Amino acid sequence: YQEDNIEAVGKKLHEYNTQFQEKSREYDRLYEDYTRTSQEIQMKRTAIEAFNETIKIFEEQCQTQERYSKEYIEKFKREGNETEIQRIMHNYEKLKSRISEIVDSRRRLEEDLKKQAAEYREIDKRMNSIKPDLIQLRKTRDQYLMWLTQKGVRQKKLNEWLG
């Protein structure tokens, strides 16, 4: 209570070791992309916070422009400088349009982070579909190696098969 020739099992040890090393390489490629994508997405997230902070600054400017303007709009109206009212207001229109450019650039980044978030998820998935094969090949490689060790196969022949 508890199989073939040595040379046939040893060939299969070599084949399974070659397949384990190759699946390993694939996993390490995906993991490098996983790491890189993780870092990139966090950089994009902090850059979005940076847009938000810049947009926030610009809206303080608008509030400031509106409060601060009044007196000098009303002063130049009584004093006949509708021309100086006109400069202040045109200057403010230029401020507003520049805000819309920055908002548009923020939106492009959010859209790119949406794609790269999906990319991250697909990498994680590809990785999780490899792990069963990678682990199964590691175990088979070891079971063959132990079978040969039990049968008394010397270390030198084992090394030839492991590459």
Partner 1 sequence: NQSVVVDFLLPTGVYLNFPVSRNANLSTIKQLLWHRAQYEPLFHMLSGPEAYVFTCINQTAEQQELEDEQRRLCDVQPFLPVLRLVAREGDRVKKLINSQISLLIGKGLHEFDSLCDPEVNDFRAKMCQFCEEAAARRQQLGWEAWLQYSFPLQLEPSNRALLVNVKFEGSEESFTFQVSTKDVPLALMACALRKKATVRQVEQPEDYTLQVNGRHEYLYGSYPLCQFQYICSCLHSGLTPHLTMVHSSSILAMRDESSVSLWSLEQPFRIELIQGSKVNADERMKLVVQAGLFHGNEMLCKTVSSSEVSVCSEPVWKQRLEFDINICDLPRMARLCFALYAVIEKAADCPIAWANLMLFDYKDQLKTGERCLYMWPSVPDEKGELLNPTGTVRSNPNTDSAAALLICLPEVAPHPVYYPALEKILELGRHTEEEQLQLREILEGELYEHEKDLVWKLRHEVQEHFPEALARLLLVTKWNKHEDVAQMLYLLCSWPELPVLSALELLDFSFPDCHVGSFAIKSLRKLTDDELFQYLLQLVQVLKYESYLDCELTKFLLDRALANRKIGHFLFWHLRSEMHVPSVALRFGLILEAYCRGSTHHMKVLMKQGEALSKLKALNDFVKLSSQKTPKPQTKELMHLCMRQEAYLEALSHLQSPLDPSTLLAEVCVEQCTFMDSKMKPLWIMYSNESVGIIFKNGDDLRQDMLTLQMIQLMDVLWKQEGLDLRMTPYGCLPTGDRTGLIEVVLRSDTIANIQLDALLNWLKSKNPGEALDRAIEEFTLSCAGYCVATYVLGIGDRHSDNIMIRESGQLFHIDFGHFLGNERVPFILTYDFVHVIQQGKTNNSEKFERFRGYCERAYTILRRHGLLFLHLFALMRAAGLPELSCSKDIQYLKDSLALGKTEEEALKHFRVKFNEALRESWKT
Q: Which residues bind partner 1 (CB under 8 A)?
A: 27, 31, 34, 38-39, 41-42, 45-47, 49-54, 57-58, 61-62, 64-66, 68-69, 72, 84, 87-88, 91-92, 94-95, 98, 102, 117, 120-122, 124-125, 127-129, 131-136, 138-139
Cβ closest to partner 1, residue 7 vs residue 146: 146
Closest CA to 92 of 118, 115, 64: 64
Contacts of 132 (CB under 8 A, 6+ apart): none
Cβ closest to partner 1, residue 4 vs residue 104: 104
CB of 10 to partner 1, least distance (A): 19
Contact 99, 45 (CB under 8 A): no
CB of 126 to partner 1, least distance (A): 9
Give exposure, 117-137, as e/b (b: 16+ Cβ within 10 Å): eeebeebeeebeebeeeeeeb
Cβ closest to partner 1, residue 9 vs residue 127: 127
CB of 129 to partner 1, least distance (A): 5
- Dump the DSSP string for 11-36: HHHHHHHHHHHHHHHHHHHHHHHHHH
CB of 81 to partner 1, least distance (A): 10
